[PDB]
């Protein structure tokens, strides 16, 4: 229930691996953000110097937050579409971290992946509808913004508009066409809430990767797990701890720590390390190499 019991034998990656291969760990939820795709060539938002927030000066914005805000987008969509052209990759190649989540699916351990990313790499790695909540939407599809129309357009169509530097307009009504992403100020998809309600009743392990846990309501998902569910963060930096003034936050280090583990480094490296403990290293290496070779062959 709301009882804090310690289920990990030690607060380390090795403890987590032993837990995962015990009978008690049947249902894993992954919570992921932009840090899992930086090694695929899509910058994150908040890393100093390389993050998007430090690379927006040329967009002539009234302030740097505006390019990801819906009110600004509706008044002036051109900066967002100019940024999209700058960031759009010529190749969509998921990372080792993405393929680790594919292994969790194939091994029958993945209850759900909640992602904040819009880059479609989870789908390319093989996560399907049953497996995936795109909490901040996706570029995979786009829609006309007019309420009476809402025509859908595929990514091939949206890509061509972005690269032509033509602001995308609906062929049926000539309204703006917007990628199916959730800007600041927009509602998250309904399936975010339906999945959260159900999934967090029965999760045995929470695996948090590549996110600063600064955007809501996504960040609050860590607090929805039962109090005895272990939580592993694989990230370059600690994240998710309660602020000492504003304060179910992460507790890696206090005298009361009992279930949260931080593995600090590259998401690809941490996933590889965890796979090795699990006996999955060869499977992961073979999977990534074959999928990458097939993508390179396209």
């Amino acid at each position: 229930g709301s009882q804090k019991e310690r289920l990990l034998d030690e607060l380390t990656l090795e403890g987590v691996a032993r837990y995962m291969q015990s009978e008690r760990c049947r249902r894993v939820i992954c919570l992921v953000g932009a840090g899992i795709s930086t090694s695929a060539g899509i910058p994150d938002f908040r890393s100093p110097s390389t993050g998007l927030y430090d690379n927006l000066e040329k967009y002539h914005l009234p302030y740097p937050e505006a390019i990801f805000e819906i009110s600004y987008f509706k008044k002036h969509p051109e900066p967002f579409f100019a940024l999209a052209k700058e960031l759009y990759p010529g190749q969509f190649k998921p990372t080792i971290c993405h393929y680790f989540m594919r292994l969790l699916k194939d091994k029958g351990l993945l209850l759900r992946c909640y992602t904040q990313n819009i880059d479609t790499l989870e789908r390319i790695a093989g996560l399907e509808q049953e497996d995936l909540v795109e909490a901040h939407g996706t570029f995979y599809t786009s829609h006309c913004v007019s309420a009476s129309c809402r025509h859908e357009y595929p990514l091939s169509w949206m890509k061509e508009k972005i690269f032509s530097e033509v602001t995308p307009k609906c062929e049926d009504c000539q309204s703006l066409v917007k990628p199916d992403i959730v800007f600041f100020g927009e509602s998250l998809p309904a399936r975010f809430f339906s999945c959260m309600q159900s999934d967090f009743l029965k999760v045995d392990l929470l695996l948090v990767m590549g996110t600063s846990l600064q955007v809501q309501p996504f960040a609050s998902l860590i607090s929805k797990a039962p109090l005895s569910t272990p939580r592993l963060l694989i990230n370059k930096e600690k994240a998710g701890q309660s602020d000492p003034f504003l304060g179910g936050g992460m507790d890696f280090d206090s005298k009361k720590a009992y279930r949260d583990v931080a593995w600090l480094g590259e998401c690809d490296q941490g996933c590889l390390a965890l796979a090795e403990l699990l006996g999955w290293k060869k499977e992961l290496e073979d999977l990534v190499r074959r999928e990458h070779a097939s993508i390179d062959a396209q």
């Binding site: 100020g185 955007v215 809501q216």
Partner: peptide, 5 residues
């Protein structure tokens, strides 16, 4: 609910 910082 809405996406917020």
């Amino acid at each position: 609910p809405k996406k917020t910082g």
